[PDB]
Design a protein around this ligand. Structure first.
Ligand code: YIU
Length: 234
């Protein structure tokens, strides 16, 4: 992800087939002549899409031009959470499945994985960053405290941001409970709050047509909501 001053991010397409699939996803959703009520509603929860972009002198180098969801914040606190019970898609080989489950074998049980966070700390005027090994080290015993860490800001637990996060996730869940045409694998929620709320769906390299509820994604959202709810009792 490259941040542009104009309030956008440029995401370089991942190698095939992932990058092309993510392009086609954005193209389908933001199709100008689209009057599909499900897809129109979905736009609210995605970054705004500004189309494919490539450098003037390099047509080979493909990017997506997306809304920077963090742009309107002064000191954004950011957390990326991968959602679902399976991080592999319906066309993965046995080895790919093994690779994906190996990456975090608790995905089925918990239904989400923290990819990382950046937390602004007022007292030090500095950022605490956690990488992918942080979330992958979390178990059922430590997931609540693992998530809570994100909301430690301003000499307190930011229960305001926790409650707001629940409310925004709930709307996304409502969308998922009113559609059976898309299933989402290895996609994320980006959480942002002001450290000095946004919750948006990102990363669509493994979104596929379906004729069923995305039960794994729903499970993930519900468990995430349950964890966040518990944090409100801290
Ligand atoms: O700091 C982080 N992430 C971050 C930082 C700043 C801006 C944005 C971001 O803002 N709008 C976005 C729209 C789409 C995408 C995206 N990424 N992959 N596909 N699409 C990203 C976007 C994200 C990470 C590292 C630790 C905590 C999580």
């Amino acid at each position: 992800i490259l941040q542009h001053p104009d309030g956008t991010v440029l995401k370089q397409l991942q190698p095939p087939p992932r990058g092309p699939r993510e392009l086609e996803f954005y193209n389908m959703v933001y199709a100008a002549d689209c009057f599909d009520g499900v897809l129109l509603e979905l736009r609210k929860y995605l970054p705004k899409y500004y189309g494919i972009w490539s450098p003037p002198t390099a047509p080979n180098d493909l990017y997506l031009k997306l809304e920077d969801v963090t742009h309107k914040f002064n000191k954004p606190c950011i957390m990326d959470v991968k959602i679902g019970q399976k991080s592999y898609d319906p066309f993965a080989s046995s080895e790919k499945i093994q690779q994906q489950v190996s990456k975090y074998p608790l995905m089925e049980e918990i239904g989400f994985l923290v990819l990382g966070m950046r937390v602004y700390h007022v007292h030090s005027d500095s950022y605490e960053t956690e990488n992918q090994h942080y979330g992958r080290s979390l178990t059922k015993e430590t997931i609540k405290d693992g998530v809570s860490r994100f909301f430690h800001n301003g000499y307190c637990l930011r229960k305001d941001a926790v409650a707001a996060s629940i409310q925004k996730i709930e709307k996304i869940l409502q969308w998922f409970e009113n559609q059976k045409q898309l299933n989402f694998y290895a996609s994320s929620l980006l959480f942002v709050y002001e450290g000095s709320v946004e919750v948006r769906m990102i990363d669509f390299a493994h979104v596929f047509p379906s004729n069923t509820i995305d039960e794994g994604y729903v499970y993930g959202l519900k468990h995430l909501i349950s964890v966040l709810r518990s944090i409100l009792d801290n």
